[PDB]
Design a protein around this ligand. Structure first.
Ligand SMILES: CCCCCCCCCCCCCCCCCC(=O)OC[C@H](COP(=O)([O-])OCC(O)COP(=O)([O-])OC[C@@H](COC(=O)CCCCCCCCCCCCCCCCC)OC(=O)CCCCCCCCCCCCCCCCC)OC(=O)CCCCCCCCCCCCCCCCC
Ligand SMILES: CCCCCCCCCCCCCCCCCC(=O)OC[C@H](COP(=O)([O-])OCC(O)COP(=O)([O-])OC[C@@H](COC(=O)CCCCCCCCCCCCCCCCC)OC(=O)CCCCCCCCCCCCCCCCC)OC(=O)CCCCCCCCCCCCCCCCC
Ligand SMILES: CCCCCCCCCCCCCCCCCC(=O)OC[C@H](COP(=O)([O-])OCC(O)COP(=O)([O-])OC[C@@H](COC(=O)CCCCCCCCCCCCCCCCC)OC(=O)CCCCCCCCCCCCCCCCC)OC(=O)CCCCCCCCCCCCCCCCC
Ligand SMILES: CCCCCCCCCCCCCCCCCC(=O)OC[C@H](COP(=O)([O-])OCC(O)COP(=O)([O-])OC[C@@H](COC(=O)CCCCCCCCCCCCCCCCC)OC(=O)CCCCCCCCCCCCCCCCC)OC(=O)CCCCCCCCCCCCCCCCC
Ligand code: HEA
Ligand code: HEA
Ligand SMILES: CCCCCCCCCCCCCCCCCC(=O)OC[C@H](COP(=O)(O)OCCN)OC(=O)CCCCCCCCCCCCCCCCC
Ligand SMILES: CCCCCCCCCCCCCCCCCC(=O)OC[C@H](COP(=O)(O)OCCN)OC(=O)CCCCCCCCCCCCCCCCC
Ligand SMILES: [Ca+2]
Ligand SMILES: [Cu+2]
Ligand SMILES: [Mg+2]
Lengths: 346, 51, 50, 206, 53, 671
């Protein structure tokens, strides 16, 4: 009627089941405003710490490349004080704090909001462990795919901003700050300058978010027997689960990010065609089908782990605290649990 | 020592198909009393008729 | 388990297994003491209850 | 000759980097081509420097060479294989020829069906449960509580339960705490569950 | 995969003969790689293990 | 030409017809053992998916009390459990081992062009689907197909024939036909349905309650269907209560996979239907096994290569185990056939073989069934040991430990399992003498298992290890088998067996045995012969994922069942005390993890076929380093191959400098 395809609306009749629980019921707190607010808060809080840690580590490396590394506690203390008072460190902290504000609000917040939207209603089993997590798997996959490319524009803007500072005065744009660079790049180079050849970042974000959120959600309920029967410390168990989740996310995400080094940084054989034709997707496929894992797992910690894992761990902890992973559990033999009360005690 | 043996058993394959059909149909008819309604998927019956 | 996982890999210390065929004759008898003790304990407890 | 089938001339053919140096169409069946041999000058010099005191080998300075992809499995030629396997019924003697080329070699073919192979558990379980609606049509549906006093009072008993909860005995039992608080309210002709009841509202009667 | 080594040996009759060391398998002809090229990869797949019976 | 496109289409049609003929010749009418084995493997995959679906149904029903899945259909739950057990036993493990693996390997390991009976091999392959369907679809199929809300009163009167019985006499005796016609017509050639709803309308003295679909004959006359549409789901009324019966006939159930009499062999308790179908399908599967083991044993005895005619030691352990299990099946199948035939006779002709009233022996049925049942599980397990016994030496570059002793241990287990069939009948009420004999032999059986375990452990020491996915699967198989056999030995305890009989402890024990060890060995063999089967190398990533998830799911699913058994939960019960909710939820979670592992296995196959890369033997042509010269040759070729494979990546210095100076994000410059 309105166009070629018609969205036919149809009415149906009443239907009900013996049990009204353990299915999908949208929680009242699961709304666009509340989910977005919680996700943005958690993402910003995590990203600030992550970027501050990254800046501190990088400034420490920069200072150590010119001065001998600490030999004892006093030398370490003075080294840290000098790093803190370094002029470059303060500017790096400011720029990376702006970058964290941009990321945690538009990427981590979006991931958390989508995850809550698509997985809030999966009720758990009363006095038991939630089974049929295969039902939740599609929701987490959908959220991860939807929110995967929300960080590539900001990351490319950051890379362009940092690479512009190292050009001569004639060839330097002269970006005042990261926010100014982000606001100017779309109008100078164009929107596609922030998305061209984004496969590595997109796949990295997907393999991070999916295997972090889903693994944490699965573990926090399946390993709950430790503190439900073994009387272990629930907070310690949750911390261990978050650590496992972030480590798995880093392991599954770094190999795809290694494609950048293989394609651009590895020396090219004179006269021979590029081993991957400059295609990050083909390089990732080669990594996937490669026999030896260590070859592309080299540099896992010196390059990516301490730049990504702490942020994911903090994000998981903050999401758990705010309640982005909280599900609704009610007794199935209670008043609202089931519609057949004649056999709940008989 | 053994002479050349044929490399295909078409009559055997069809005999096994008939054995399966007999087993299923006979068991369903004797114990379930159910006979497949070939008209439900009328196009396979029409496939037979055309063939 | 520790020895196999630490040294028996090709990378660390492979060993040239030149032995052709086994020669054990009573290792089965020697090993079956433990399951024999298991059976003896099971029989004793079961009969005491019975 | 047709340039449309030539990767060098036709730029629309997407080259597969993972199959560089391997041409399945050039296989022999049986394969009788040597593509591996002694290789030096990569890390081990081909010349002699055992006693050269002025030369020391540094294997770390390995120059990068062309990537050697793993050998690709043979790909079937449909017409040739069908002709080779084809035998004339009552015109061919039943025998095996001396030539070994008559051996029936396995060649990998289309890969599309293997997608369905990989997705088979999902497809099979969907057919078993969703397609056949097993064990019933309501188990997999989103759960909805029955409407108010539906289908019959003897089954629903919403009004009597509400009155009992609002009565003296109901309040005393709630105070005892063995019985949980009421989970629904009877509005003006409709039953509304509380947001903490953790259930959906009853479906409309239409 | 055809021969793992070769040697030239002078027999008791004074003639030099070539001896080739065949590739072997652990009791499993299925695991044995039947090929006719100096290649380690298992390229040839045979439906009839014994073509001539 | 004016019909170039038509010529191309004609070429396409010719190609399609030729391809159809080629496929029919090569995969349908073929007698090639390898192709038959591949088809057997695909059929086994389908049957395993069916069994997994049945197990999922069982686990969903057992998730929490109150029958969330079957909603009170105890008979349906029992039928589903029996179908699951029978399908898994007789149509997953047996087709995998004796169908695919045996048909694929025995010719290789005996040196025969084809099996002694290629026709019988093809027949055994093509016969499975009927039995598989019969034993799998009983849960769906019932003699009382209609649901509880179907108004069969709208259709049965049409089927009724006694209404017109009065005309039958006059159809042959015309003398008084006119007098009969001169009677009063009350309900001749007419149907009247009594009121189904209370109606108070003084205007009308009669009301019509005929079915709406049967209201008009003008459309019914030309419709060639039975009058079931009128009664099929025409009322909105429903009752969603567990206590509401869904099947009017309480006898439409199954007696499990054990066929316990007189429940199994009397129609008063297990009425006509799924029980009789299972009886006949069991006889059918027995005859199929007859054909299979006859073909395979005669193949070995008549077509084995010279030098391996009698030397069982030289053959690979899998082949030895397969032949021993085939001999066991040949020994035991007639007993099961006779017992099943007697059950059928009791059900139909009422021969009272198992009726105590006039000499019947209900315990005779259990004796006869278990006499085959225990050797059946031994047959299922014995071939699993061969997979590890072959894989561990292959990856360790070392001879297996005490192959002769392992062979003798498996043989002693095989031919001593014929005197322990009564451990499934301790409490039935048999004489204490027989009970003690069964217990003693059952506990004695533990020793050869310990011998095999110690041999497996010793096979891993002092060798050149080559870690691979088959090796990891073998390790998981060993880990599962240790606990499985330990739990079986504990069950051998008579006093504990009294409490653990027909409990979930036995369920956990035999699940850890079959689902753990047999499946781990099957997957290990699949990954060991992946190149021989599919012609391409497997994908190690999805392989590792499948291994991890499958092992974890098995453990998580079958460990809590031991706790349930210790608590005291009986078997074959769909509704249980509230105190088992946590462990049942854990079991369901483990089953779902196992299903995820199966998904990973299928994705592994798909990704391997996508990769379509030629496989390379790990031994490089030197399976055994019997001499230092062989070791040197292997080392030289291995180093050369490693250099060739590493020829396309940067050197250590370049990689280190790149990793060190990767970071390029600074703020201030100019030094
Ligand atoms: C929600 C769904 C949930 C489903 C869950 C399913 C779960 C189970 C399955 C899971 C696995 C699924 C795998 C799918 C197939 C993947 C195939 C593959 O790997 O190759 C593709 C492709 C390979 O291309 P290539 O030729 O090899 O080039 C390699 C280059 O390095 C990279 O290529 P490039 O550099 O040539 O191009 C990169 C791309 C970059 O594009 C993006 O970043 C967009 C996101 C999708 C990109 C995907 C690639 C392009 C695909 C075709 C076009 C897609 C259009 C957009 C998406 C909708 C249609 C699908 O550029 C473009 O295509 C055009 C960009 C134009 C400029 C940017 C403008 C953006 C819009 C702004 C205005 C509108 C929004 C704001 C205003 C709104 C109104 C107020 O790789 C990728 O692009 C990334 C693949 C990553 C795979 C891992 C899993 C993550 C997948 C994420 C994709 C979806 C993101 C969210 C959008 C869709 C949902 C909303
Ligand atoms: C329980 C056993 C009972 C029987 C005992 C029998 C006698 C003792 C065992 C026999 C000897 C095994 C020796 C293994 C270590 C070898 C040397 C070494 O350090 O490894 C590095 C070595 C690679 O070094 P490379 O060759 O120099 O690398 C250069 C290239 O990159 C070339 O690299 P690529 O291309 O080969 O790729 C390597 C890549 C790709 O490979 C993988 O990703 C392997 C995936 C294995 C999955 C299955 C293992 C369990 C996974 C966790 C499940 C949760 C529960 C775990 C605990 C309970 C269950 C066991 O993996 C990695 O990136 C590194 C793997 C992690 C190494 C772990 C270091 C400790 C090893 C010592 C034993 C640890 C035992 C604790 C449990 C295991 C911890 C990992 O890895 C291998 O050769 C593969 C095996 C790695 C360990 C897994 C296998 C042993 C455990 C078997 C468990 C069986 C049950 C499975 C189901 C469980 C269900 C819950
Ligand atoms: C239920 C029972 C389970 C029993 C089994 C599990 C228990 C352990 C079994 C025995 C094996 C482990 C013990 C021996 C090895 C120990 C590790 C070692 O020596 O290597 C050190 C190595 C560090 O690098 P590096 O080798 O020293 O090289 C330094 C270079 O200068 C620069 O480095 P690069 O950048 O050049 O990169 C070099 C990197 C090259 O890159 C790689 O190779 C990375 C990929 C390795 C393989 C990954 C797959 C296999 C492992 C996972 C699956 C099996 C375990 C399952 C566990 C289930 C849960 C219990 O080298 C490696 O890391 C390879 C060797 C070590 C890792 C692989 C072999 C050991 C197995 C994994 C141990 C760690 C497990 C963590 C938890 C796992 C949860 C699932 O690895 C680590 O330190 C990672 C583990 C510790 C992570 C701690 C933080 C995690 C959470 C994030 C926190 C973020 C900040 C916030 C903190 C807040 C605090 C409140
Ligand atoms: C012009 C004519 C064509 C001439 C050319 C040549 C034709 C060749 C035809 C060859 C036919 C081969 C046999 C076909 C069997 C089909 C079965 C079937 O689906 O039947 C049901 C089918 C559909 O019924 P439905 O209600 O959908 O489903 C069946 C009900 O569920 C349940 O129904 P039910 O309870 O009544 O059960 C009956 C059902 C079976 O249903 C069951 O499943 C129940 C089974 C109960 C079994 C109980 C016992 C258990 C079994 C084992 C017992 C023994 C023990 C074994 C074990 C050992 C124990 C010791 O099977 C039948 O209907 C029997 C066959 C009917 C007669 C068809 C014969 C056609 C002519 C053949 C000779 C032609 C050559 C003559 C010479 C020409 C030259 C002069 O009904 C039909 O027969 C319709 C198709 C008829 C086709 C006729 C031939 C093609 C021509 C059609 C006309 C086209 C226009 C022509 C114009 C010409 C212008 C010139
Ligand atoms: C593959 C299948 C399989 C295998 C191999 C076995 C093997 C054994 N079984 Fe079992 N069994 C079944 C499948 C199997 N069983 C099934 C399906 C049922 C129920 C059928 C039904 O009713 O439906 C059953 C029932 C059953 C019962 C009856 C329980 C009851 O009804 O109450 C008994 C009683 O003794 C028993 C004993 C044994 C013994 C002694 C072995 C021996 O073969 C095991 C010998 C091995 C060992 C004893 C291992 C030694 C251990 C180690 C070396 C490790 C030690 C390490 C530690 C202790 C840490 N089995
Ligand atoms: C081989 C035999 C076998 C196997 C593998 C299984 C596997 C499983 N079984 Fe079962 N079971 C039995 C044989 C088996 N079972 C028997 C004999 C009974 C007794 C019945 C009775 O007494 O009435 C029984 C009873 C039984 C009960 C008791 C029900 C009751 O009494 O109320 C339960 C409850 O959860 C159960 C669950 C499971 C689960 C979750 C698995 C999981 O392990 C299932 C996961 C799936 C697989 C393990 C196979 C998947 C297959 C493939 C992926 C294809 C592979 C193909 C190739 C490799 C080529 N089984
Ligand atoms: C090893 C494989 C099997 C693994 C175990 C699976 C068990 C359940 C059966 C699913 C089979 C297909 C795989 C789908 C997995 C993801 C969806 C899922 O698991 O569905 C469960 C969930 C509804 O379940 P829920 O209502 O929560 O149950 C308790 C209610 N009191 O539903 C949802 O979350 C909504 C999902 C909507 C989309 C599902 C699409 C499924 C398609 C399957 C293939 C269909 C093939 C049809 C072929 C037709 C041919 C003509
Ligand atoms: C759950 C069973 C089904 C799943 C598979 C089981 C496989 C068993 C294999 C044997 C080895 C593992 C240990 C046994 C399983 C875990 C413990 C368990 O089953 O929980 C019961 C136990 C407390 O039980 P109980 O003392 O009877 O409580 C009575 C309260 N009035 O609980 C405790 O005391 C808590 C002990 C938790 C140990 C977990 C170890 C395995 C999980 C992976 C490693 C976790 C590492 C980090 C642990 C952090 C702990 C702070
Ligand atoms: Ca239940
Ligand atoms: Cu037994
Ligand atoms: Mg019993």
């Amino acid at each position: 009627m309105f166009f070629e395809l018609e969205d036919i609306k149809r009415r149906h009749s009443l239907y009900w089941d013996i049990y009204n629980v353990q299915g999908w019921v949208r929680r009242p707190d699961s709304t666009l405003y509340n989910n977005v607010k919680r996700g943005v808060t958690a993402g910003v809080v995590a990203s600030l710490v992550q970027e501050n840690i990254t800046a501190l580590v990088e400034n420490c490396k920069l200072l150590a490349t010119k001065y001998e590394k600490p030999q004892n506690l006093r030398q370490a203390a003075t080294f840290m004080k000098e790093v803190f008072k370094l002029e470059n460190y303060r500017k790096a902290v400011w720029n990376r704090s702006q970058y964290a504000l941009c990321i945690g609000t538009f990427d981590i917040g979006a991931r958390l909001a989508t995850f809550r939207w698509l997985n809030n209603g999966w009720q758990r089993v009363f006095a038991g462990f939630e089974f049929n997590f295969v039902r939740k798997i599609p929701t987490t996959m959908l959220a991860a795919l939807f929110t995967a490319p929300f960080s590539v524009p900001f990351e490319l803007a950051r890379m362009a901003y940092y690479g512009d500072k190292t050009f001569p005065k004639e060839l330097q744009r002269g970006y005042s700050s990261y926010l100014s660079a982000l606001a100017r790049i779309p109008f100078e180079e164009g929107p596609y300058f922030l998305f061209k050849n984004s496969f590595p970042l997109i796949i990295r974000n997907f393999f991070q978010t999916f295997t972090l959120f889903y693994t944490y959600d699965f573990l926090k309920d399946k390993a709950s027997f430790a503190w439900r029967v073994g009387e272990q410390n629930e907070y310690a168990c949750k911390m261990i689960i978050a650590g496992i989740s972030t480590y798995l996310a880093a392991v599954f995400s770094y190999p795809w990010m290694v494609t950048r080094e293989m394609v651009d940084f590895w020396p090219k054989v004179p006269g021979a065609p590029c081993t991957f034709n400059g295609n990050y997707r083909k390089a990732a496929v080669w990594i996937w089908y490669h026999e030896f894992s260590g070859n592309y797992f080299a540099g896992f910690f010196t390059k990516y782990f301490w730049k990504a894992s702490p942020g994911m761990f903090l994000t998981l902890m903050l999401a758990d605290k705010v309640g982005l992973f909280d599900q609704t559990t009610v007794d199935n033999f209670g008043g609202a649990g089931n519609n057949s009360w004649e056999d709940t005690f008989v | 020592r053994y002479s050349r043996n044929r490399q295909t058993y078409r009559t055997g394959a069809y005999w096994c198909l008939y054995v399966n059909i007999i087993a299923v149909v006979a068991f369903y008819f004797w114990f379930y009393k159910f006979t497949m309604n070939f008209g439900y998927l009328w196009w396979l019956l029409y496939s037979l008729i055309l063939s | 388990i520790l020895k196999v996982a630490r040294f028996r890999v090709l990378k660390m210390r492979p060993k040239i297994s030149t032995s052709y065929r086994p020669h054990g004759k009573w290792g089965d008898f020697l090993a079956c003491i433990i399951p024999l003790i298991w059976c003896i304990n099971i029989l004793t407890n079961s009969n005491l209850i019975l | 000759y047709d340039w449309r089938d030539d990767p060098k001339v036709n730029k629309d053919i997407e080259e597969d980097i993972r199959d560089r140096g391997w041409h399945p169409e050039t296989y022999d069946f049986p394969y009788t081509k040597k593509h591996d041999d002694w290789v030096f000058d990569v890390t081990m010099p081909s010349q002699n420097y055992q006693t050269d005191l002025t030369v020391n080998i540094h294997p770390e300075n390995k120059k990068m060479h062309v990537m050697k992809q793993v050998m690709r499995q043979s790909y079937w030629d449909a017409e040739h294989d069908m002709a080779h396997e084809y035998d004339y019924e009552s015109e061919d003697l039943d025998f095996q020829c001396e030539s070994f080329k008559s051996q029936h070699f396995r060649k990998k073919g289309p890969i599309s069906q293997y997608l369905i192979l990989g997705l088979l558990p999902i497809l099979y379980f969907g057919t078993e449960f969703f397609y056949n609606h097993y064990p019933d049509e309501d188990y997999w549906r989103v759960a909805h509580p029955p409407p108010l006093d539906y289908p019959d009072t003897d089954d629903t008993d919403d009004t009597e339960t509400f009155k009992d909860y609002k009565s003296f005995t109901g309040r005393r039992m709630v105070d005892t705490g063995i019985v949980d608080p009421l989970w629904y309210d009877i509005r003006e002709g409709k039953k509304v569950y509380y947001d903490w009841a953790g259930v959906n509202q009853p479906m409309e009667d239409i | 995969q055809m021969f793992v080594a070769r040697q030239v040996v002078t027999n008791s009759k004074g003639e030099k003969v070539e001896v080739l060391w065949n590739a072997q398998c652990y009791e499993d002809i299925a695991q044995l790689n039947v090929g006719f090229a100096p290649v380690l990869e298992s390229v040839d797949y045979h439906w009839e293990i014994f073509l001539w019976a | 030409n004016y019909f170039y496109y038509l010529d191309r289409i004609k070429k396409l049609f010719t190609y399609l017809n030729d391809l159809r003929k080629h496929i029919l010749k090569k995969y349908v009418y073929t007698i090639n053992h390898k192709r038959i084995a591949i088809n057997y493997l695909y059929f086994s995959m389908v049957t395993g998916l069916s069994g997994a679906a049945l197990a999922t149904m069982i686990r969903l029903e057992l998730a929490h009390p109150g029958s969330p899945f079957f909603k009170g259909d105890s008979l349906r739950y029992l039928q589903v459990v029996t179908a699951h057990g029978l399908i898994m036993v007789f149509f997953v493990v047996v087709p995998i081992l004796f169908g695919g693996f045996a048909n694929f390997l025995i010719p290789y390991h005996v040196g025969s062009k084809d099996v002694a009976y290629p026709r019988l091999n093809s027949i055994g392959f093509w016969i499975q689907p009927c039995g598989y369907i019969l034993l799998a679809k009983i849960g769906f199929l019932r003699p009382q197909f209609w649901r509880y809300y179907d108004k069969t009163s709208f259709s049965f009167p049409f089927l009724e024939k006694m209404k017109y019985n009065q005309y039958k006499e006059y159809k042959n005796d015309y003398l008084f036909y006119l007098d009969f016609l001169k009677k009063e017509i009350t309900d001749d050639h007419s149907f009247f349905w009594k009121a189904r709803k209370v109606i108070k309308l003084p205007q009308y003295s009669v009301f019509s309650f005929v079915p709406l679909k049967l209201m008009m004959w003008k459309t019914m006359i030309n419709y060639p269907e039975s009058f079931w549409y009128a009664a099929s789901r025409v009322v909105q009324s429903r009752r969603k209560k567990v206590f509401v019966t869904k099947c009017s006939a309480r006898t439409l159930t199954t007696a499990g996979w054990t066929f316990i009499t007189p429940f199994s062999s009397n129609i008063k308790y297990t009425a006509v239907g799924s029980q009789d179908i299972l009886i006949l399908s069991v006889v059918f599967a027995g005859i199929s096994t007859t054909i299979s083991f006859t073909n395979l044993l005669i193949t070995r005895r008549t077509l084995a290569m010279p030098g391996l005619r009698h030397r069982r030691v030289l053959m690979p352990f899998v082949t030895i185990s397969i032949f021993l299990t085939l001999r066991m099946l040949a020994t035991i199948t007639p007993v099961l056939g006779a017992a099943v035939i007697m059950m059928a006779f009791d059900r139909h002709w009422q021969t009272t073989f198992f009726e105590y009233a006039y000499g019947g022996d209900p315990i005779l049925s259990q004796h006869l069934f278990w006499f085959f049942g225990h050797p059946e599980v031994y047959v299922l397990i014995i071939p699993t040991f061969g997979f590890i016994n072959m894989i561990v030496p292959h990856n360790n570059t070392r001879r297996v430990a005490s192959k002769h002793h392992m062979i003798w241990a498996i043989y002693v287990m095989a031919y001593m399992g014929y005197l322990v069939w009564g451990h499934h009948m301790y409490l039935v009420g048999l004489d204490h003498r027989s009970r003690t004999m069964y217990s003693t032999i059952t506990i004695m059986i533990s020793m050869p298992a310990t011998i095999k375990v110690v041999n497996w452990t010793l096979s891993l020491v002092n060798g050149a290890l080559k870690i691979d996915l088959p090796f990891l699967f073998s390790m998981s198989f060993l880990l599962l088998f240790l606990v499985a056999g330990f739990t079986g030995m504990w069950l051998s305890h008579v006093s504990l067996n009294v409490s653990m009989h027909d409990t979930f402890y036995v369920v956990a024990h035999f699940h850890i045995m079959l689902s753990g060890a047999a499946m781990t060995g099957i997957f290990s063999g699949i990954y060991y012969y992946f190149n021989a089967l599919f012609g391409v190398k497997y994908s190690r990533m999805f392989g590792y994922m499948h291994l991890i998830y499958y092992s974890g799911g098995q453990w998580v699913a079958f460990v809590p069942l031991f706790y349930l058994g210790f608590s005291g939960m009986p078997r074959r019960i769909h509704d249980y005390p509230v105190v088992f909710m946590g462990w049942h939820s854990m079991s369901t979670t483990g089953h779902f993890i196992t299903l995820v592992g199966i998904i990973f296995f299928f994705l592994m196959m798909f990704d391997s076929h996508i990769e379509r890369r030629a496989s390379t033997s790990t031994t490089l042509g030197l399976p055994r380093w019997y001499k230092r010269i062989s070791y040197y040759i292997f080392k030289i070729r291995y180093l050369q191959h490693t250099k060739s494979k590493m020829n396309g990546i940067p050197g250590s210095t370049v990689r280190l400098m790149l990793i060190n100076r990767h970071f390029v994000e600074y703020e201030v410059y100019e030094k």
